[model samples]
Target: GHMASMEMEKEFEQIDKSGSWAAIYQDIRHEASDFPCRVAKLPKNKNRNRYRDVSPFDHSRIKLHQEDNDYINASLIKMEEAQRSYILTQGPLPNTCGHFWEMVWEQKSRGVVMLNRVMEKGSLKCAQYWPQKEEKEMIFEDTNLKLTLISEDIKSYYTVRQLELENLTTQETREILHFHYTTWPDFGVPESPASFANFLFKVRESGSLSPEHGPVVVHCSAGIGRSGTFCLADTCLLLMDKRKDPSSVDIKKVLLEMRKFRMGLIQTADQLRFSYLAVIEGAKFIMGDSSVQDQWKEL
Candidate 1:
């Protein structure tokens, strides 16, 4: 409620004064425990994950509907109090792309948020999971899935596309809203809190994050870094709206809770700080600051 306004302001001012955001970030990083990720480390599921060290915990890992081996490097971050759920996972590998789509279909997720580009710096950061415009469609023959690009509305910082996902066996289809934030650097925050918050709201406006539908699937290269920032920002903002006491809203605690589903959320101090900026900015609009949108546009 009104508490978020006061709480966020207090923390922001403190960060400005102490210049100890890194120390705070370090505390959060150290505070998180080494949870069991045995499944992610297994030989059978070894190649399903993108990074060697980044693995989803065995406890909250998403099990596939496949009969042979039900494994995917994905976790369903369920926040019941915030009335939100996000399927946080690593970027789909070229081989695991079908499993990625299968998880989406199995979970009935209506939206997919791609926070990193297919190529970054000099490397292939993420798999070419979706179809590029020229191809029109990409069919996953083994996974019984097909993705046809409906349309693309490209913006300067991001691109939004409508994709038609078909279940080949049943021939049933659903429209999947693809939100790609093109410019976010790997392991680094976005350029501005305004655009980041605005993009977060854009996903919100799609009715994709709503409880009436399935959890929105969000991923970056390793899935815990930028993906964690996105989840933390959105969830903290929602908790800010849902709670009435300023003292009770602790961003660090909220993030620690999130780390249970997946590890190393808010990778760097910069990312952790950016999450604060984005949430505080997002709360401006949610708190009924009508001129906030204008202020954001001025950036």
Candidate 2:
């Protein structure tokens, strides 16, 4: 694992030094304006999203078939080759929390992967969208949905909670797994790729992220930067495992393909580089070389 990691580091360093990665990243940014973005113009989404700059594309946005308000600040990221997909969404605003849950219910989503904290640098990154332990039930009257906390497991770097979401109109409920990665910084990477990989595996182990299930909802503040990082790493690792060749994965091409669904994914050069680190390190675990947590402790 150590040797593979060193080689990956050197490879990533070379990619950075050559300026190819930045050039590709800049190209994506320039072309994003041409992407299909119409969610903000819709009447239903007016003042519901937390940020004006972040909006889901018309072609790929997740639609709420069951709700009168069909708008949500979320996009569907589908990687057909990898047979994996995710609902990439912004952190829920106070008003849009109902829409957030509505998307989960309508899509039959099994889990949510939250990459940002509730508050960052004293700014509210996301609303407290889920039910707390003390407040076991949260009612979204507007959407007629009920959220109840089933269980919660707190970890040092992340938290796992079992949540039950009920459709009030139908009295139907579904168990949703909430995986919160606590340490990732804004415009920064996790302390090590090992920890992030470990968290990814934990989500994978629960079977929530599988293609058999509905798409897992992944979100950060804008649902572009860190959310994009997570999906890119996971998909690259899946490709590596499927092809049995770590070197076969093209990080730049994959990101560009993913960007087709959600604009401006992997927000910065550092985040893009970190995605490479996490993917390479995760490949080591997929190859049965080492446990990612053990690698983290050793580092």
Candidate 3:
């Protein structure tokens, strides 16, 4: 947890100096298995996803009990050691917003951790699926899920909003938390790890991601870059806490294990580097460095 900055910086430099990250990235891409995209070809699930190759594994995909179209580009990621589970999916497309909420309700997810914006690099990454400021409520007739904005708390780099989801048929309602990270760029890392760690801890404090709760919903444009970074950092930090030895935790091994559940975890070398930085910073806070929390105060 208290690794010297000089040592960590050298580690970052070593990967670049030796071009080790390139081979690692390429190896991950190669090692990834190509299962049949069976659901993606189905008429109902065809256009529901923003990308074709990003379909969920048949065994792990979430299915709607009563709906005709049960497919969504989401996969259930279960990390046993961390005692955490997450539903990682691509950002919602216009036609898939209804299905997205349907999966959320069916999964009984308590939190939605969004790592991308609606638009980036002049392209739409995700649809505005939730209720915006002007709109008090958003109705998804296809899925019969009504979303009403309860409240919003804004910070410099992110926004936390309370949302209520009601099943139009059953007349049952549940509260959901929407955590949006607004500043992370496409195919890039955040400016600093401190801010990212702060956000991760904020989510942890809510208890929405605990094992007692259902799998927390996490997504980015592709659900593998920033989303992967978040999950990897969180899991590694948790392992560090359990083992009480920062050096004992292997980031690469964790990423490889995570990739088994989903295709890609860290998209780029820079993203992988950032994940390591974040885990280190987060570990400090967990190891009684109370002052570390203030380092990200402005964000």
Candidate 4:
């Protein structure tokens, strides 16, 4: 679509210019505006969402709004467009984070199947913030499910190797996981979307015995990086769009499509770029070369 055509619908809509909520009290409403920023706890009762009663991005909690309602609206669009047999979450986006499990539960309750939770930080990592004995137990309570645990703790020792095997194999339910956490971001690594693509591959190739039912759970620290990366990679894997460079996938398109229900996605350039890198990496992985492994070291 041309920029003019895109602007035609949004030109008059109120948009935050200062990237701060200081102007929120002032009406920046465009001539045909139908919505405005609302501050409240997210995932609230649908009825309370209209006037700032249930937004996760309460203006008061932020240093600078830095992003407008449109920024989040874009994220919602991306989620809605996903057709993969799964849903992915990354380090946090606006309204998605620790509560991702509940969000998935809600989606399941509503009979909206196909939604699942994939965490960047696995069960143990999640428990660090939302500590509940039930969280750890939940990992084993269900079978035919997948989890992506993001942490460097890949050392599952063999202290009770035999018993561990027995417990895993004899469990009534089963679970699949990808335990990979790297210090990439903290090391000043140049942001790239390729690593995410490899993570997806890791998930696909890992094999363990389990049932044939349930949903896929996708999540990360904030439900932006890991989740966005998974969702975008899935789209590219399936050739969902005509764009030649999957690395530059259009998050704005993805967000708008998901907004009617799932709001707030792809908050920053780095977040979006991670998804791009996933697509690029997926291509390289298919080509069978480890040559691109050092790309992140430069940044």
Best by lDDT: 1
Rank list by TM-score? 1, 3, 2, 4
Clash count, one per candidate: 0, 0, 0, 40
Give me the overall lDDT of model 1. Answer: 0.87
TM-score of each: 0.95, 0.90, 0.90, 0.43
Candidates, ranked, lDDT = 1, 2, 3, 4
Cα-based lDDT at residue 129, candidate 4: 21
Q: Kindly list the per-residue Cα lDDT of model 4 for residues 184-238, writing each as its tens digit.
A: 3432223445544544554544421112322344444444334444555555544
* lDDT accuracy of residue 227 in candidate 4: 48
Q: Which lDDT value does model 1 have at 22?
A: 92
RMSD of each: 1.7, 2.9, 2.7, 12.9
Lowest summed lDDT over 10 consecutive residues: which window, candidate 2? 1-10
For model 2 the TM-score comes to 0.90
lDDT of 3 by residue, 1-299 (tens): 44433344466567767878777777767776666667766777677778765767776666765546667788888999888899999998888888889889988899999999998989898999999863669999988889999999989878999999999999999999999888795546888788788889888888878877789999999898899999998887777656543446767778888887777777887888789888777767676676775765556
Candidate 1, 1: how far from true, in Å?
Answer: 3.7
Q: Which stretches of candidate 3 lie above 4 Å from their native place?
A: 1-19, 244-247, 290-294
As for model 2, its CA RMSD to the true structure in angstroms is: 2.9
Task: Give the 10-residue window scoring lowest on summed lDDT in candidate 1.
Answer: 241-250
How high a TM-score does candidate 4 get?
Answer: 0.43
Off-target runs (Cα >4 Å) in candidate 2 are: 1-10, 16-21, 31-33, 244-247, 290-293, 296-299
Cα lDDT tens digits, model 1, 1-299, are 56766778788889868998899989998889678988788898877878998988888899989898899999989887887899999999989999999999999999999999888888997899888773669999879899999888898778999999999999999999999988895546777887888889999999999887889999989999899999999998888876754434688889999987888987898888898889888888776687786866653
TM-score of candidate 3 to 2 decimals = 0.90
Clashing pairs in 2: none
